[PDB]
A paper describes a structure:
Glutathione, the tri-peptide γ-L-glutamyl-cysteinyl-glycine, is the main low molecular weight thiol antioxidant in both plant and animal cells, often present at millimolar concentrations in vivo. It is synthesised in a two-step, ATP-dependent, process: glutamate-cysteine ligase (GCL) catalyses the formation of γ-glutamylcysteine (γ-EC) from glutamate and cysteine, followed by the addition of glycine by glutathione synthetase (GS) to form glutathione. Cyst nematodes have exploited a series of gene gain events to redeploy glutathione synthetase-like enzymes during parasitism, within the syncytial feeding cell formed in the host root. The most recent expansion has been coupled with a diversification of structure and biochemical function that has given rise to enzymes that are introduced into the host cell, and likely possess novel substrate specificities.
Numbering used by the authors:
A (entry chain A): 8 to 137, 146 to 158, 160 to 376, 385 to 399, 402 to 467, 478 to 487
B (entry chain C): 8 to 136, 146 to 347, 411 to 467, 479 to 487
The structure:
């Protein structure tokens, strides 16, 4: 439909020019690459011109499973023994992970000072044509929900400009749930003079998004919430543990620490690591806690696909629907350290039908040859090959002429969960917000047009 | 109060950083100096950190006289003989003005094809050391009313950040009146397929503001209003007069031409002048018409101060209050000085002694044939502030 809708270069440029102005007028913006430390100039956030086609059934399935998925990862994060078991080996050959695990060990040894925590999740999916919905990533660490909403809103404007029906563009209000969840977390701390802290880099494209969150939180609190920004580097000097286990930022009590510095992604130096430790040992409500953040590493994602493992976290028969709904979104994955029957027959099928698999990258005849003659097995993993649905769209990026390209995407589904780490109870578990991230076959922001 | 409120460089920068982010998040923006033809990047509009002190009495006086002032200039614009009399001499030593006057002559000779017109006015004032003095009247290319509103809104945020009362910051909704007035003008043309045209430069800082007006007009019309942009240069090729005196933009009827290209300010070439003539001879509703635009030249401003001349345009005794209120604002002027911080892209904010001018905005929708007036509203204001400039808004005392 995108190619049919845009029938000339004149129309393309009128549409793009409207879109770019709309983006700036409505906060669909980022700091520039030249000045990631300054807000004096902004550029529009890179987006598709129109919302990419996406099947309704796959979308509704991804949305429907999300709350169950958040409950799963919350329970994983609460299961100290499972997490320590999952990390036993990789800690000995990854110093960064070792330090993070040691902070969780220190926090657990001293007893949980703050039971309330806020999980924030984006689950990523792709549409396999070799359509079926397949989970490809879970992110519980540093999570642009305002940008996603504004992208949906831009796309409705653009749909009207080409005479298309906007009812197939689904509602996208993830930022409202986020703000409410963060406000609820701050109220739960029980001190109206306690700070709300954005743990964040000095260099960041998304500063405008964070400021929007600040303004909304200040409005919700009727001006009572004091908001501050600090990095882990600056935090080494400015953050301290009080004698009552309060987190003190330059001597003032911190009620909530909302992190946009990825626990797994950011290679922190020794000082940054100590600042992280100070935060984790404090009684501040963490959004998210470190355990929540590392509950969704690739290792744990893989472990959760093994036989019987979902059932450990959903032991009751009343939750069998949640198990089935999550499992049917799993990508086929078979670690070759195991020599059980299901893995062995899988190896044989991959040798005979190598076009259907990937070995980790080996493909087709090379994959088959490697499986035939590899002794080496424990480090390799066999997976189902995924072929994404292709469509066509125009990308808007600052100073790039828009062109029609063949594109593929991933669906992101967002939500929050507010829970108690001591008894594993859940006060709030909501799916809200989504996005498409679209690339040529980093890519651009996008939103679904349901069919 | 500004100096007392900001008691450290650390606080100053936290406030400024909040303000700059707020500006970008809320559309208080301009195209960059490097790329006045492109919207890919934007900078925040230059503003004061806090609203400058301004006396309430002077402000209320400037607001109160505004509708009378719009009625005055509308009646001047309707008085063909007065305008031709006023320009008899200056046309012989100002070729630019001569060409504009000749277009009005050509339009008048053929009979007025479109009686409905929209006057848009900014009146500028300064505080003489206080008494309110009118220094300029602008009935040509106005714009920036959304920027003025957002500046007021930013200033309320900043007042709260330093614990000051926001009730002395007056309401600033000039953009709503503008949009309603332009929509009313478009409805009055009587053709739901007729275009709304922004007559505008390809290079312009305020493009974001115009797009905002477009979106609001599209919303008000329930998607029926088709909006286009054209310059006078491109207009020379793309605008024509139809055999029924319709203004045609690439063959499509134009219902309203809203101008942000100043009639008196922009030194137009021959082609641009012909495009202007084509617009003026058409039946499109002009916002504003050329007669309205040149009704507020410096020459006419001066002529309106001479004895008995206001009374020619307000002949009735029932309008004697309007005459007195306008005449009281007539004029060496020494402006009130205060202190403030300026926020400009890539400039560190510093405390300076500053002076300003008050701008008061409004619209008037009227009929050029019988001089009747359907709509006459003051709405919107601004401060423009300079070292003894930037956008600013008043803190009334």
């Amino acid at each position: 439909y995108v190619e049919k809708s845009v029938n000339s270069e004149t129309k393309l440029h009128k549409l793009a020019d409207f879109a770019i102005d709309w983006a700036h007028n409505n906060g669909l913006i980022l700091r520039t690459k030249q000045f990631l430390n300054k807000s004096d100039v902004a550029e529009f956030a890179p987006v598709s011109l129109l919302p990419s086609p996406f099947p309704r059934h796959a979308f509704e399935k991804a949305v429907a499973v999300h709350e169950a998925l958040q409950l799963l990862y919350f329970r994983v994060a609460c299961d100290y023994e499972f997490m320590m078991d999952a990390y036993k080996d990789v800690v000995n050959t990854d110093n960064h992970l070792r330090q993070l695990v040691n902070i969780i060990k220190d926090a657990h040894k001293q007893g949980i000072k703050q039971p309330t925590t806020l999980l924030i999740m984006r689950a990523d999916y792709m549409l396999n044509t070799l359509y079926e919905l397949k989970q490809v990533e879970v992110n519980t660490g540093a999570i642009g929900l305002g940008i996603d909403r504004r992208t949906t809103e831009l796309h409705r404007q653009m749909l009207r400009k080409v005479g298309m029906d906007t009812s197939n563009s689904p509602a996208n209000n993830g930022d409202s749930n986020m703000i409410e969840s963060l406000f609820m977390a701050w109220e739960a701390f029980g001190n109206k003079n306690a700070l709300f802290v954005f743990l964040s880099h000095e260099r960041l494209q998304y500063k405008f998004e964070l400021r929007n969150i600040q303004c909304q939180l200040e409005e919700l609190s009727n001006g009572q919430m004091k908001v501050e920004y600090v990095s882990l580097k600056a935090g080494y000097e400015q953050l301290k543990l009080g004698e009552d286990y309060s987190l003190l930022l330059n001597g003032e009590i911190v009620g909530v620490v909302y992190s946009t510095i990825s626990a797994l992604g950011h290679q922190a130096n020794a000082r940054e690591m100590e600042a992280r430790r100070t935060i984790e040992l404090s009684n501040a409500i963490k959004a998210p806690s470190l355990a929540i953040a590392i509950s969704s590493s690739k290792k744990i994602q893989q472990l959760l696909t093994t036989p019987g493992t979902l059932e450990r976290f959903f032991p009751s028969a009343t939750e069998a629907d949640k198990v089935a709904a999550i499992r049917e979104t799993f990508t086929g994955l078979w670690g070759l350290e195991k020599s059980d029957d299901q893995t062995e027959r899988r190896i044989k099928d991959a040798i005979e039908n190598p076009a259907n698999y990937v070995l980790k990258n080996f493909y087709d005849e090379a994959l088959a040859e490697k499986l035939r003659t590899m002794p080496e097995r424990a480090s390799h993993i066999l997976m189902q090959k995924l072929i994404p649905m292709a469509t066509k769209n125009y990308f808007l990026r600052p100073f790039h002429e828009p062109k029609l390209n063949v594109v593929v995407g991933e669906l992101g589904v967002n939500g929050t969960l507010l829970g108690n780490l001591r008894d594993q109870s859940v006060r709030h578990n909501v799916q809200s917000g989504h996005l498409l991230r679209t690339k040529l076959r980093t890519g651009v922001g996008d939103s679904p047009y349901l069919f």
